[PDB]
Structure 1
């Protein structure tokens, strides 16, 4: 199952290119609410809150890019 590994999230906004690895966690029975999880280049890990418009815009601008082919 693996429930939400982030009990709290990030409400303050920040520039995305700093994130070396932006990976969001999917939702399901393990966790009804979806949670984001970026990894700052300084070796930090901050879960983001999609309730804001910057977290969802930052994840969209960071995810929307060359993926394959």
Structure 2
């Protein structure tokens, strides 16, 4: 109608550990989103949506990279 359709509207509100993260996803602002949404895939086979607006998200995510890079 007049608004966009971001791939993820509601984000997560519970800090956790990359211990349950096997795949990370990131989608920059698009024709459906005027911002940034960091999507992720939990090993349990689930896909959640985090918000960079939270400091703990920048940490648990940075850790995933440090682990995926050290591997």
What interval of TM-score do these two structures reach, taking the shorter chain for normalisation? 0.7 to 0.9
Q: Which has the higher strand share?
A: 2
CA separation of 1:21 and 1:32: change in aligned 2, threshold 3 A? same
TM-score, normalization: structure 1?
Answer: 0.75
TM-score, normalization: structure 2?
Answer: 0.73
In the alignment, structure 1 segments of 5+ residues that lack a partner are none
Question: How much has 1:2 moved relative to structure 2?
Answer: 9.3
Runs of 4+ in structure 1 off by over 4 angstroms are 65-69
Q: Which has the higher helix share?
A: 2
Question: How much has 1:60 moved relative to structure 2?
Answer: 1.8
Alignment RMSD, CA only?
A: 3.2
Question: How much has 1:56 moved relative to structure 2?
Answer: 1.2
Count, aligned residues: 69
Q: How does 1:51-66 map to 2 (within 5 A)?
A: 51-64=53-66
The reply to whether residue 47 of structure 1 matches residue 66 of structure 2 is no
